[PDB]
Amino acid sequence: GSEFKPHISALNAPSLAQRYKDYFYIGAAVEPYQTTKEKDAKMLQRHFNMIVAENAMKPAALEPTEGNFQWADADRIVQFAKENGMELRFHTLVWHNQTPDWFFLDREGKPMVEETDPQKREENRELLLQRLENHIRAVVLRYKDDIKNWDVVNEVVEPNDPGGMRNSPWYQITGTEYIEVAFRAAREAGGEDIKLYMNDYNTEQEPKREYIYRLIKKLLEKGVPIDGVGHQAHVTIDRPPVDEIKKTIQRFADLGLDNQITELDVSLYGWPPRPAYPTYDAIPEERFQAQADRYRQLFELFEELKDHISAVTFWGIADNHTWLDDRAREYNDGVGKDAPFVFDPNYRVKPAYWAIINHK
Amino acid sequence: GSEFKPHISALNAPSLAQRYKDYFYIGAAVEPYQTTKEKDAKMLQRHFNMIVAENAMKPAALEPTEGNFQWADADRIVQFAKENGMELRFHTLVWHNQTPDWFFLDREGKPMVEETDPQKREENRELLLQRLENHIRAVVLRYKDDIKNWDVVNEVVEPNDPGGMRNSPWYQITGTEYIEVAFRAAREAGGEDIKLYMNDYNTEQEPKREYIYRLIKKLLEKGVPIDGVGHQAHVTIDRPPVDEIKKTIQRFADLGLDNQITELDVSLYGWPPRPAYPTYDAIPEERFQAQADRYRQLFELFEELKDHISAVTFWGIADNHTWLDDRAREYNDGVGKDAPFVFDPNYRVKPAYWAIINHK
Amino acid sequence: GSEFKPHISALNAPSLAQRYKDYFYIGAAVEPYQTTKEKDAKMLQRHFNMIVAENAMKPAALEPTEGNFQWADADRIVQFAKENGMELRFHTLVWHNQTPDWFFLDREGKPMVEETDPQKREENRELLLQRLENHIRAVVLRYKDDIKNWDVVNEVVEPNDPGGMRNSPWYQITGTEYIEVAFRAAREAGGEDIKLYMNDYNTEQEPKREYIYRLIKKLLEKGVPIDGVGHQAHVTIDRPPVDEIKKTIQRFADLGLDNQITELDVSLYGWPPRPAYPTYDAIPEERFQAQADRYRQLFELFEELKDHISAVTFWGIADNHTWLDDRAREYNDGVGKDAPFVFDPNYRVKPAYWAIINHK
Ligand code: NA
Ligand code: NA
Ligand code: NA
Ligand code: NA
């Protein structure tokens, strides 16, 4: 144990975004209801100068059937950021998950992935790319003046698949062209001022890192205007090692790319939740102290790499809301709690908060 | 002697604020008449991108009797800053000096500090906190869109007093609650965008440093939204040592606090003015050269700590106006002159100017 | 050979200005036609956040006869920068080249440099300084709200001339007073917010460096409001050595001066073009790899000196347009091609691009 400053309320504790003002933005993923929850709204105004929609801007949320755009939840998050002078990230224009099946049906209502006529396959490819372009055109035309950071594609690399290309219907139907078109359409509709990212997880693992590096070079060679890599950084206390994170950021920086940490959380367990504690009160202090040392190591690394990192965004606000609790229950027969942030479920600061707010 | 660049006019000499553009703001304390004095106004526009009122915004200046707000002098300083794109600091919402006695009278016209009925003392405490809240509400509502930096309380720690709490009437009547309320009211009226400081002098001395650190932690534990510490830095050529200054800034940074240097001057004498020179022309060059080396050491330290220091403000413009001349005369039987700045009384640069403007 | 990343199109390659966002602006010299050439305009929007007129704002371009101001070409460049949020530099208010002869004729139509009556010479000096003041007044009044960076005088030092002062008609008629007046008039018309530079080439050579340093100190002693030195940096692969560049920047920083690199190019040849290659396709890869290592060394030096350098501007966009091709032909009997940029004549990135865009 090394962090023994008091567990004060986070609502008025010194601002995390302030601490990192000349390093990178400090962001949080939010749901629309949190923009009007008193404590969550206060937490955002106190600690965060960047916001991303955890779920409200995924493809199925915004265009659940063709041409039927659903803007209300997304507008709510954008308006909260505008009211409070926060930057925004867009999650996400393209993803194999959270994508409605109408994209991948031919004009006949049948799955394009089953088509065997080569000329018809080329027509389906053209049609799917037009649908993708229209999804992007609508969303970027609406938000381009307010959202500067765009996860144009998400999780398109899978090292277990041939050539490293995740074999989603996107890839089955268009190869890598859906990725090329996604970036071109985003630039066409949004102009030079928006920053376009390829977002993925385990970006430091090999050979996934090579595959992402290879893909970006291939896209660059095709004239694709990519600006950066987003690193989800869903990490644990021990994995991955900090030196591998450092080499990954430097590596993509060598292609001229900006880097953002997009979905940061530090689980208390391994991958998978080998044994979750059942309740929050059951987590011993030693675990939070271990998590504090890990957060310290991460953020001091981010400071060293500050000229290659424009933003660090957490995948949530406080420990009362995190996607890791679904996984904790799942692998522990219905009961389990994770604690991945620097703010606890009662909106108090954790040892990890003091570890990243201090002078180093 | 080490600084032999010419003693050019400061009016058009290279800008001090420019030199520190990516480190911290460079500020000066001013009186309203100096916003319309040709040479002082030019000096501010040339060298400073932050302004503070030396006297015009103290409690007795702004609310000399209850509810009788006097805005003219303060408005003048704020308008000069706005015309010239300068940031502002507010000195100061609460101070045991420069505070009119009406605050501390019960509704009966008698000193609250003399009251012996416990229930009546609690009523006086409530009344004094309401008067404090109204003073802050009026001032912050008026200036919140123009002043980002607020000395919410000033000089509230005194190591000679029990528990380190300066035993002013504020503390005699309310304990530390006046400090809690001062910060809460300032945040309530001004929003999250204004930065709230506790300002004091000798912040590197022990045990004063501990007492300030202890008090801030206690206020943080009560939910108080403090953002930073202001260090007056009324220093001499030899005191305090630079390593103690460094440890102080780092120490408060460890609580997540920003730091500003708020009232910087480097006296030519010890504490007290053991022997002032009678006139400015009597000061030998060796003294200015010693003062230059001291200013060099201070500002190179500030550069090293730049990510913990947002602003460095001098307690005046040029050597023709400084509060240290009152003290120089006082302790030298009516005659005496100090020279605490980098600009001399004829608006020429001093060796100290060249020492902090150069490449290091 | 060390840089083997692909020679992708530069039009959508990761942004150079983005890479240097927290170091200095990245600029390019342009001609008006390039603001409407599809590829040049795209290159500026992709890679550059600062623009300078290669020729359209020289004295003869803007005021070819007395009082006959020609604004169209200059306005075009300023409007392109404004549309795209780019900063601007002004090249240049005073220069011995590109200056129409009407400046230097007495009211009698005869060359002021030939006048032998001392009282008449003082009248011509006064008249030439009034004409200079009016040229500057007109240009600064028109553009002061849009152009922050002003090359007030250009190439006024010549180490082969007595006292180091280039013996142009400006100096023959007014001594150094034309320089004093140029800076004062620019400040008078433009205010404190515009930054005023003395621009020259070979600024690291001795004794030219001493002469510039000496002149600036003399101007500072006369009350002249100079803010910075512009270093043209028309360099080769081997000259000048990087340590001499470093000492030059530090040296002028010691006078409190900002520094900008104003006309950067890295010729493939010596001075003069000892042997140009006849055509672009004749340049071997080894030369581009040598040029890449040189650009790497320069920009890593600029990063180290980032707090003394506000902007780095290239004297052109891509290798299809550069003034060095006139000199390559000249000294090679009509045929010759240089390649001084990081972007090639077909708007593809060069090894030098990868060398300055990477993580270091
Ligand atoms: Na730095
Ligand atoms: Na989720
Ligand atoms: Na005073
Ligand atoms: Na030219």
Side-chain angles (χ1 to χ4, degrees), chain C residues 66-125 127-187 189-242 244-270 272-273:
Chain C
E66 179 167 19
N68 171 33
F69 295 101
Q70 298 294 332
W71 302 120
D73 284 351
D75 283 358
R76 173 87 290 266
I77 292 172
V78 169
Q79 179 61 215
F80 181 86
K82 286 168 67 175
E83 285 166 358
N84 296 285
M86 305 158 172
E87 292 297 302
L88 285 144
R89 319 196 68 261
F90 187 92
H91 175 251
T92 174
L93 287 173
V94 179
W95 191 13
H96 69 281
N97 284 335
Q98 304 303 311
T99 289
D101 273 304
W102 67 260
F103 274 104
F104 310 122
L105 298 177
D106 69 22
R107 276 139 166 150
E108 286 199 69
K110 302 312 169 166
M112 295 170 161
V113 294
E114 304 178 349
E115 177 62 53
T116 57
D117 182 69
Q119 296 191 4
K120 189 54 155 71
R121 288 195 65 86
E122 295 305 316
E123 287 165 17
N124 289 338
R125 174 182 131 280
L127 172 60
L128 177 56
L129 297 172
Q130 295 172 345
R131 288 162 173 178
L132 174 57
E133 286 181 70
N134 193 61
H135 181 83
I136 293 174
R137 172 186 308 116
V139 170
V140 174
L141 281 189
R142 190 181 185 85
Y143 296 132
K144 53 170 170 71
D145 300 324
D146 294 311
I147 303 185
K148 196 202 190 61
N149 309 276
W150 292 78
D151 285 344
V152 172
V153 309
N154 196 45
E155 297 177 10
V156 305
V157 166
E158 174 42 72
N160 299 323
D161 283 342
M165 309 299 187
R166 184 180 295 275
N167 201 37
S168 61
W170 287 115
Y171 184 73
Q172 293 175 259
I173 294 154
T174 79
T176 61
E177 198 170 359
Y178 78 108
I179 303 168
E180 310 166 34
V181 160
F183 278 97
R184 306 299 285 263
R187 176 71 66 230
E192 268 304 322
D193 291 335
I194 67 172
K195 290 194 301 183
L196 309 182
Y197 296 82
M198 168 183 290
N199 189 52
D200 219 326
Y201 61 89
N202 293 338
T203 54
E204 81 290 336
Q205 300 296 124
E206 297 282 9
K208 195 184 201 167
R209 185 170 62 205
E210 182 171 278
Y211 282 133
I212 295 166
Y213 187 94
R214 289 170 59 176
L215 177 54
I216 288 173
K217 177 176 153 160
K218 192 183 104 136
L219 297 168
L220 286 174
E221 290 162 5
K222 290 157 181 290
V224 170
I226 173 175
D227 305 313
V229 177
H231 312 263
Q232 287 183 22
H234 295 292
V235 308
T236 72
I237 290 173
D238 297 310
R239 73 132 292 261
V242 153
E244 288 304 332
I245 298 175
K246 170 178 195 180
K247 204 181 122 94
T248 302
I249 296 293
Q250 295 188 314
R251 184 198 196 126
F252 293 113
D254 283 340
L255 286 173
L257 303 165
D258 185 45
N259 301 268
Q260 302 187 333
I261 313 300
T262 56
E263 311 185 8
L264 181 57
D265 37 46
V266 182
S267 184
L268 296 192
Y269 315 118

Side-chain angles (χ1 to χ4, degrees), chain B residues 8 61 97 187 310 341 343:
Chain B
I8 57 170
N97 284 335
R187 176 71 66 230
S310 59
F341 300 126
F343 307 118

Side-chain angles (χ1 to χ4, degrees), chain A residues 187 192 213 221 223 225-227 250 253-256 307-308, chain C residues 5-6 8 12 14 18 22-23 42 45-46 354 357-359:
Chain A
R187 176 71 66 230
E192 268 304 322
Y213 187 94
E221 290 162 5
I226 173 175
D227 305 313
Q250 295 188 314
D254 283 340
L255 286 173
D307 284 305
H308 308 305
Chain C
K5 280 170 180 54
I8 57 170
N12 288 309
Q18 252 297 317
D22 292 309
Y23 294 89
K42 171 84 180 197
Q45 303 177 302
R46 183 63 173 158
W354 296 115
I357 210 85
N358 75 168
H359 84 268

Side-chain angles (χ1 to χ4, degrees), chain B residues 43 50 81 91 142 169 195 213 215-216 219-220 272 292 353:
Chain B
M43 284 293 290
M50 170 173 289
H91 175 251
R142 190 181 185 85
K195 290 194 301 183
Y213 187 94
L215 177 54
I216 288 173
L219 297 168
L220 286 174
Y353 165 89

Side-chain angles (χ1 to χ4, degrees), chain A residues 111-125:
Chain A
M112 295 170 161
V113 294
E114 304 178 349
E115 177 62 53
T116 57
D117 182 69
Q119 296 191 4
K120 189 54 155 71
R121 288 195 65 86
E122 295 305 316
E123 287 165 17
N124 289 338
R125 174 182 131 280

Side-chain angles (χ1 to χ4, degrees), chain C residues 273 275-285 287-296 298-307:
Chain C
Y277 294 98
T279 191
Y280 194 80
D281 279 301
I283 306 167
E285 175 64 24
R287 301 306 295 145
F288 297 130
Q289 295 287 333
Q291 168 185 64
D293 298 341
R294 169 66 148 172
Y295 260 123
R296 172 181 291 285
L298 292 170
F299 268 81
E300 293 178 0
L301 175 61
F302 298 157
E303 292 183 314
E304 186 192 339
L305 304 166
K306 72 187 183 57
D307 284 305

